[PDB]
Amino acid sequence: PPRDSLREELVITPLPSGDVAATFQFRTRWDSELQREGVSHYRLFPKALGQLISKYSLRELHLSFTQGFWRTRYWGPPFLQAPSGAELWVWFQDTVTDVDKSWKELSNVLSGIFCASLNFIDSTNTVTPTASFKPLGLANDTDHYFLRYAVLPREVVCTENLTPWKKLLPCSSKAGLSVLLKADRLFHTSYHSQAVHIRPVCRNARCTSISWELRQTLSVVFDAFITGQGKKDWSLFRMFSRTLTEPCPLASESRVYVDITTYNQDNETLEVHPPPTTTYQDVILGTRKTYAIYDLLDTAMINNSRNLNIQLKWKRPPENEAPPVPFLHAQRYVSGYGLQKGELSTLLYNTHPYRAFPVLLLDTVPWYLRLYVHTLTITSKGKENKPSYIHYQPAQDRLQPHLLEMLIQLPANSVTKVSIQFERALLKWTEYTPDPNHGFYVSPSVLSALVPSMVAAKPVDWEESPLFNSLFPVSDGSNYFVRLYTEPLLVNLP
Amino acid sequence: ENAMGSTMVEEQFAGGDRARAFARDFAAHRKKSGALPVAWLERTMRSVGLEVYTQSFSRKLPFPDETHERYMVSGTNVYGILRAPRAASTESLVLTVPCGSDSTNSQAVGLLLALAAHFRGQIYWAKDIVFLVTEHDLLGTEAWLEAYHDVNVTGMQSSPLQGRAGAIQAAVALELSSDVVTSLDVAVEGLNGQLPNLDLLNLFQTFC
Amino acid sequence: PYSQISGLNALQLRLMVPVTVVFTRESVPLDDQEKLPFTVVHEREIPLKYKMKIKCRFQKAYRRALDHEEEALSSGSVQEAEAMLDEPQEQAEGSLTVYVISEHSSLLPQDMMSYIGPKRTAVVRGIMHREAFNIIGRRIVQVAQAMSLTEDVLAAALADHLPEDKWSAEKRRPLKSSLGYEITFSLLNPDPKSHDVYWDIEGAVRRYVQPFLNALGAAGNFSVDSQILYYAMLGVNPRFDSASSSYYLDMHSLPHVINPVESRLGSSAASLYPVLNFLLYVPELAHSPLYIQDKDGAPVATNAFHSPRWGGIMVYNVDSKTYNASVLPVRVEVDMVRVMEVFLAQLRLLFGIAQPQLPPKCLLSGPTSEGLMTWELDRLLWARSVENLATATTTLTSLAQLLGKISNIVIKDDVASEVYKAVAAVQKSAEELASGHLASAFVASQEAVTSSELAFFDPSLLHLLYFPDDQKFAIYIPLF
Amino acid sequence: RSGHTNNWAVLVCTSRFWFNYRHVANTLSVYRSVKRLGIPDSHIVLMLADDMACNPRNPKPATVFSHKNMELNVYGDDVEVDYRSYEVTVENFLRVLTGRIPPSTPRSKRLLSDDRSNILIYMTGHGGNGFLKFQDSEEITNIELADAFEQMWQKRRYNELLFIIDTCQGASMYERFYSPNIMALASSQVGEDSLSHQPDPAIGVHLMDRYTFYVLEFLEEINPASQTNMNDLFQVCPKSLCVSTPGHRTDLFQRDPKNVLITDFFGSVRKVEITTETIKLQQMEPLKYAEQLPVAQIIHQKPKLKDWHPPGGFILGLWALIIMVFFKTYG
Ligand SMILES: *[C@@H]1O[C@H](CO)[C@@H](O[C@@H]2O[C@H](CO)[C@@H](O)[C@H](O)[C@H]2NC(C)=O)[C@H](O)[C@H]1NC(C)=O
Ligand SMILES: *[C@@H]1O[C@H](CO)[C@@H](O)[C@H](O)[C@H]1NC(C)=O
Numbered sequence A: 001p002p003r004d005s006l007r008e009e010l011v012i013t014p015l016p017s018g019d020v021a022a023t024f025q026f027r028t029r030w031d032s033e034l035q036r037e038g039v040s041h042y043r044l045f046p047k048a049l050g051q052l053i054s055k056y057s058l059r060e061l062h063l064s065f066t067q068g069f070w071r072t073r074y075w076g077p078p079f080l081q082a083p084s085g086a087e088l089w090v091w092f093q094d095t096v097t098d099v100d101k102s103w104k105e106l107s108n109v110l111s112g113i114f115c116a117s118l119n120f121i122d123s124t125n126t127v128t129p130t131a132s133f134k135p136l137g138l139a140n141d142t143d144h145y146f147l148r149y150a151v152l153p154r155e156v157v158c159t160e161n162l163t164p165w166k167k168l169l170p171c172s173s174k175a176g177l178s179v180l181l182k183a184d185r186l187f188h189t190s191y192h193s194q195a196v197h198i199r200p201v202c203r204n205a206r207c208t209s210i211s212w213e214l215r216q217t218l219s220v221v222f223d224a225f226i227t228g229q230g231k232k233d234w235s236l237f238r239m240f241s242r243t244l245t246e247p248c249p250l251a252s253e254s255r256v257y258v259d260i261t262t263y264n265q266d267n268e269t270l271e272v273h274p275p276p277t278t279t280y281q282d283v284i285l286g287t288r289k290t291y292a293i294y295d296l297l298d299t300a301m302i303n304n305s306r307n308l309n310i311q312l313k314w315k316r317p318p319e320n321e322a323p324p325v326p327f328l329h330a331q332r333y334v335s336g337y338g339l340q341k342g343e344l345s346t347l348l349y350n351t352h353p354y355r356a357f358p359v360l361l362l363d364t365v366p367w368y369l370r371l372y373v374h375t376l377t378i379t380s381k382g383k384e385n386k387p388s389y390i391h392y393q394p395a396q397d398r399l400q401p402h403l404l405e406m407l408i409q410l411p412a413n414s415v416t417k418v419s420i421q422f423e424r425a426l427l428k429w430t431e432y433t434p435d436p437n438h439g440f441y442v443s444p445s446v447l448s449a450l451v452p453s454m455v456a457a458k459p460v461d462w463e464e465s466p467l468f469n470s471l472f473p474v475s476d477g478s479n480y481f482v483r484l485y486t487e488p489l490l491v492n493l494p
Numbered sequence B: 001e002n003a004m005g006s007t008m009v010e011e012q013f014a015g016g017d018r019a020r021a022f023a024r025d026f027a028a029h030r031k032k033s034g035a036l037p038v039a040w041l042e043r044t045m046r047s048v049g050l051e052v053y054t055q056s057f058s059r060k061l062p063f064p065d066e067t068h069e070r071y072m073v074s075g076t077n078v079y080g081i082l083r084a085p086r087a088a089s090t091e092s093l094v095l096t097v098p099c100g101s102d103s104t105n106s107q108a109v110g111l112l113l114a115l116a117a118h119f120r121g122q123i124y125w126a127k128d129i130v131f132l133v134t135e136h137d138l139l140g141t142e143a144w145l146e147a148y149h150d151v152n153v154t155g156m157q158s159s160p161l162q163g164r165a166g167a168i169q170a171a172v173a174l175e176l177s178s179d180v181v182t183s184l185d186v187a188v189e190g191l192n193g194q195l196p197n198l199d200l201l202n203l204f205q206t207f208c
Numbered sequence C: 001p002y003s004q005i006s007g008l009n010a011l012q013l014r015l016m017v018p019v020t021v022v023f024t025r026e027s028v029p030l031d032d033q034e035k036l037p038f039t040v041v042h043e044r045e046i047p048l049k050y051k052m053k054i055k056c057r058f059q060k061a062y063r064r065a066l067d068h069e070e071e072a073l074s075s076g077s078v079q080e081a082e083a084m085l086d087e088p089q090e091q092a093e094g095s096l097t098v099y100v101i102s103e104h105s106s107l108l109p110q111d112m113m114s115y116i117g118p119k120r121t122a123v124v125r126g127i128m129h130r131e132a133f134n135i136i137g138r139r140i141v142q143v144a145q146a147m148s149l150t151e152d153v154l155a156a157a158l159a160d161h162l163p164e165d166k167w168s169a170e171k172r173r174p175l176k177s178s179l180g181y182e183i184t185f186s187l188l189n190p191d192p193k194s195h196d197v198y199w200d201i202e203g204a205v206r207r208y209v210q211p212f213l214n215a216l217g218a219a220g221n222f223s224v225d226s227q228i229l230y231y232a233m234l235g236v237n238p239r240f241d242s243a244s245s246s247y248y249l250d251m252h253s254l255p256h257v258i259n260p261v262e263s264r265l266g267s268s269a270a271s272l273y274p275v276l277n278f279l280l281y282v283p284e285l286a287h288s289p290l291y292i293q294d295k296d297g298a299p300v301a302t303n304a305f306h307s308p309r310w311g312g313i314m315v316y317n318v319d320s321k322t323y324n325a326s327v328l329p330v331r332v333e334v335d336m337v338r339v340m341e342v343f344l345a346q347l348r349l350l351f352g353i354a355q356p357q358l359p360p361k362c363l364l365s366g367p368t369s370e371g372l373m374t375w376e377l378d379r380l381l382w383a384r385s386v387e388n389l390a391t392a393t394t395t396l397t398s399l400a401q402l403l404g405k406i407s408n409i410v411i412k413d414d415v416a417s418e419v420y421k422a423v424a425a426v427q428k429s430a431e432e433l434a435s436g437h438l439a440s441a442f443v444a445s446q447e448a449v450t451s452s453e454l455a456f457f458d459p460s461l462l463h464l465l466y467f468p469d470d471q472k473f474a475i476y477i478p479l480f
Numbered sequence D: 001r002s003g004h005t006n007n008w009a010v011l012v013c014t015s016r017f018w019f020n021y022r023h024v025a026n027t028l029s030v031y032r033s034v035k036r037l038g039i040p041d042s043h044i045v046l047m048l049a050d051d052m053a054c055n056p057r058n059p060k061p062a063t064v065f066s067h068k069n070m071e072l073n074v075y076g077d078d079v080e081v082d083y084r085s086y087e088v089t090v091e092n093f094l095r096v097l098t099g100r101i102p103p104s105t106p107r108s109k110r111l112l113s114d115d116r117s118n119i120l121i122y123m124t125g126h127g128g129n130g131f132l133k134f135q136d137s138e139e140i141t142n143i144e145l146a147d148a149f150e151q152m153w154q155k156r157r158y159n160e161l162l163f164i165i166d167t168c169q170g171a172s173m174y175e176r177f178y179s180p181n182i183m184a185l186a187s188s189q190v191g192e193d194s195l196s197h198q199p200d201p202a203i204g205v206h207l208m209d210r211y212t213f214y215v216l217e218f219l220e221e222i223n224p225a226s227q228t229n230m231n232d233l234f235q236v237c238p239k240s241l242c243v244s245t246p247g248h249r250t251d252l253f254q255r256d257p258k259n260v261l262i263t264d265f266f267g268s269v270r271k272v273e274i275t276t277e278t279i280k281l282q283q284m285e286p287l288k289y290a291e292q293l294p295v296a297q298i299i300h301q302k303p304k305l306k307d308w309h310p311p312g313g314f315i316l317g318l319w320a321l322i323i324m325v326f327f328k329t330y331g
């Protein structure tokens, strides 16, 4: 037994607007004591990331680089979502004495590995959430004293970021699904995100021991008009300019999932040209979805003398038979005009016919946009809505930002608006950027909720389920958890 | 300004027949309706690949107007958004066609739709583009701007907006009532004697 | 402390080593033994430049033998004599000991005057004839210079301060002094479809590598790591021989071999210390029998080579019999003993410890466990101390000049504290080098270099952070 | 016959916006060449002031081209940049050169050269007579650069150095050098102070400068096992292909340029030693996952909000003080 294992899976999903989305996912498990000093020999788990867990006491780390914005209202709900720019949140171990020093050192170390400007994380853009961003792995106690979070909304994701990312994979772009990752195709898209997640998980079914899991993910969306404008179907060759020829020799599971469910008709499926190995039916995000499975380890599918090119017929469905809009989506904008005063507004939609559900809202604002909290208003259907929980942290000039956290119950079939006034500040002449007439950015806001489900889901075992079904722990079979991000805002100063 | 002075653009537009046919179909529908054809505009806007939205507005005038023959005015505005593929929704440019009740500017609408169909298939946009058609000549524009910035400057009533595209940087209005032209005329003066930046006029003259 | 720093630029270093010479009964002539207790002194100088001067001295005391020493030295092998006579086992580094036996002795093969062993001890054969006490002195200084100090030992250090000559370049090849070092072992598997390579590092490190580094740890601290890299390739394509049915890498292609792998080696280092890399390469099946060739063109026995200040590489051929299994991949296991033999030889050669050079008609002891003798380690310590002192002096002079030149740079209290610490450490280390206490001098020189370089590279010594003194009149005139 | 054992390179672009595509293209071409000839990515410190490969204005994302035929992409599949758009400044460049860097800076972003290292430095941007501009706010003068190189020489942090600048009036930047073993090349002399402007139609901008274009064309034929000297780069881009005149200063340098290979500064050729020696060696409670969004616990984690009221002692003190004052003036 090697004591460590690797799995890889690609999922392809047509979208209600006529676009096509793809997600790559690589996962490794290791039965080792990484939390304590002493491990010196590495095989499948990368050495660059493996020695950070002990040097800086880390329980969980999450890092993402993204361009674009996910259009929930027109694309549907995603498996995973990230804000524009770069975000980083970390859970530390309770033995850590000074969290700020370790947080600064860790950000500086990560900036070297991932070729990003993470050294710009400081006290003016770091918060400590009190009810959001709970652990995603095995946890005993949750004291938010040990959690940090930050976002840089103007960071750029280009090939220079993808080169280190591909360097940490074991087959390293020379075998398996990794041969499809070509930069020019990957950036000719409407959405692009790269992510890394580290957390501890159960070692076996009884779950009395710990194992450490690393997960690397990449997701893109291909637009219909710009890409694949012609009547030719969505094949692998036209999306990635490459076909699949052979499996990674180090992986124990390697497969491609194609979503072939048709909402309008009954027991009718989309057409996939190569006959698949198997079909898989399950409840995903509160809906019964059907997938076609191509098993790359089968020698019926892929051999030395014949490779794989999958083809899929999909066009934007007629106005009738289109899927209904999701039960939750949101928007954000700036009100007013001039260079003195303004307002920040958020709109929250509940499109469910008869059920009301609560949401948790987290907002962070820079110190230069001074906020007046006696002007905060929340209105649903023309009546005032009183939040159950509210936490406010005021800003200090050049020291810390604003933080606002609310818990609001949303009435059914309605839209709710949240607003607050601000005033702009005049800075010193040395505190502006090289291009001072462009403006400043307010980071995107976070929304978390438990959305009701159409169908009830059965309990699932993480070692026998697809990788896209085991990202969030499930507490009840009648709801599911979502975390949404709005868009960033651009504001000018005198 | 070196951002525009040091660059060059190679045009490749070719949609004349489509613009003509759009204009002919728009004029007939407006004849039948007696006002702005809204369903046709929405369907046609969706066919070329935009996100479409509408807005209703109304107001009461201080006294009856002889020049335009209005006392109490109600109408609807239709606008469509093109989202920049490789960016977020932070900045936007506006192209608008103001329609009156005098059966004019059909060719402007046709050209607008053809230009949207040409623009939809590119990758190099760094800003969103809004394509706007208003109901009454300058009351619709005022209603749309007031609803967009969420300010009640005049007292006009409206339905709330559902789609926005960030901060607006520049705008261009087009008026055209013939298939051919002999010249193009430009206007710069605005309300209360305010003026735009001279660089916009220099650009227009550079493309002339 | 500007005046003391101005004094440090011209430094006199005098390295003294204590040697204890014992004359056994009836070795020196009886009349010669009348004046046996007395001290002799051998001093020499190394010509240098830049106003710094060094000299080296041997301090020999000719005490007569204690009787118990005779029972031990009397008869048997040299090993038994060393075992019995090593009873005191006191703490002394840079110190030697020499015994003088009869010209008819049967413990020294009767064909040779000297026996060099490990553990800082040697054996020499005297003259019963009373020609003089000079030949004894020549023989003793010959043995002492084979061990201990030589002008070649201090050539990698002192390299700048010594006149350049032909063959200067290769005398600069060894590693430079540092507090710590990183060692990483990597296994390269370019064809995972054909070969399933498993190795046992943890046992190999524990059994063989750790005692070696424990012996070598007198110079600095050491770290050990390991990893496996898949689909990692070489930067040259081997030539095929139809007659041999094998593949070759020629001597001209070797300088370009390790280029691609360095793209995957870098960016995993955990510190700012110098890093050393040792690579084991299992060739692809397409060129499975791979051999490295010398300048003449004959295959080399170790099948490996190393590069100065970087590390080494070894190619590992799979047995043809192990290829017999129809199932592909084929499980292959590496023999760790030979791999560590080659790698430890390379590591010992990278620090600059060459094979001992023997005086004529001498005999060297058998190889020890962990592969290192003690006098070699003491030699390394001497060189390290000299290099550290030179570097600290140069850094302090440069810092003083820089602060003298520019006037608007701020001097904080931490910087001054570090400067005082450095000057005191330099003086103490020089004194203890003169007194002959090598370990304390080494520690003090380490502290000196650390403090001086901590002061020199402070982020606040950047001239760009301060308002120019030229433009101040513009500011004070308007309200004055 | 060189006597070095490792190679380093620092390549810097000091421009901004999208219409300054040319400087970034030049830097990318140099990076491609030095990688192809052997220098590892951990020994190259690359500083780029703006991103042109994934700029949303780019008609071809993730590509940067040198000629309008679009047959060579200089950004490439494999690239790593150490300093991003907002960390490129005069101050950081000087810190990197002098070693006076903040303590928490990682290894990949510092230059760890020694006595046995050859270094190549290349710069490009908008400059004048005796200065080079960083973005638009600041500038670096020739005196400061000449001082930094002497700081590097006094600590023995290089063996030989090669400096190349591609700017208008670029010869002014190597006039004050006074340290041993430095060779310098420039694209234009002090008088020559205009710049060309021929924008490319499909992309929309001016692609690349002439001198670096011909220098990159002469580095595309050179291979790892080349015997070309440094006397052949002194005859590249004669005034006839360029319209300005290239210069060189080689009086601080000790070796003859006819004996200096190109790969001594543009590649990595190792010194190899066969090893012929060897060292003899003897042969019960289950664990659970956290709950996302627990509503009741969140509601009860904070005490309820009561309205604020002034403390009673403050009221008593106020009124006692006031009446004590009143009883003086009245009684
Ligand atoms: C702008 O303000 C005016 C008031 O000046 C609002 O007008 C009122 O609208 C309500 C609801 O539509 C009517 O019932 C009232 O009769 C209107 N009052 C007057 C005095 O006309 C108008 O609704 C506001 N517009 C927006 C978009 O908020
Ligand atoms: C794959 O290759 C094998 C061996 O040549 C062959 O038998 C098989 O038919 C090929 N693929 C198919 C068509 O199943």
Ligand SMILES: *[C@@H]1O[C@H](CO)[C@@H](O)[C@H](O)[C@H]1NC(C)=O
Pocket: C179, C180, C220, C221
């Ligand atoms: C080497 O490590 C030991 C163990 O912690 C430490 O005491 C010593 O100071 C270290 N030596 C150096 C030179 O860092």
Ligand SMILES: [Ca+2]
Pocket: D041, D042, D043, D044, D045, D046, D080, D081, D082, D108
């Ligand atoms: Ca680098």
